[PDB]
Amino acid sequence: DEMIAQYTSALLAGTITSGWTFGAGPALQIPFPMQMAYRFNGIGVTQNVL
Amino acid sequence: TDNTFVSGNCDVVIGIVNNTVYDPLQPELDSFKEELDKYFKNHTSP
Ligand SMILES: *[C@@H]1O[C@H](CO)[C@@H](O[C@@H]2O[C@H](CO)[C@@H](O[C@@H]3O[C@H](CO)[C@@H](O)[C@H](O)[C@@H]3O)[C@H](O)[C@H]2NC(C)=O)[C@H](O)[C@H]1NC(C)=O
Ligand SMILES: *[C@@H]1O[C@H](CO)[C@@H](O)[C@H](O)[C@H]1NC(C)=O
């Protein structure tokens, strides 16, 4: 139950800093105030709402 | 301006940086301002 808590603490450390790029190759850094503006662009609303 | 779209004033957003953004229509009329510049000196001088 510690190594399981180590895996789920590593997914949260890459989905915050890198986003989704670490699931399809080498991890690339991106600020979190700007990753969140990429998730709106995949919904239908533009960037300026964020 | 083809790559960018404008949205409102530039004070609400945090982390903005100052730079310049160019337009493509302005250089199209730039070739005619230099053309008309020579004919102005040929009328005022005499
Ligand atoms: C367009 O660019 C100019 C110059 O790059 C900007 O003018 C200056 O921008 C700096 C940004 O760091 C301002 O400094 C800030 O001053 C405040 C108040 O002292 C301070 O709390 C901040 O930590 C920072 O040091 C500077 O005041 C500003 N000067 C003037 C005369 O505006 C300008 O802001 C840029 N235009 C826009 C719309 O951002
Ligand atoms: C300027 O005016 C003179 C008139 O004597 C003319 O011969 C010449 O071709 C003119 N040059 C231009 C560039 O318009």
Chain B contact present for A48, CB below 8 A: yes
- Chain B residues within 8 A of A48 when measuring between CB atoms: 7-8
DSSP states of A3-50: HHHHHHHHHTTTTTTTTTGGGSSS-----HHHHHHHHHHTTT--GGG-
Overall resolution, Å: 3.6
Which chain B residue shows the shortest CA-CA distance from A50? B13
d(CA A13, CA A19): 9
A contact test, residue of B3, B7, B17 with most A CBs within 10 A? B7
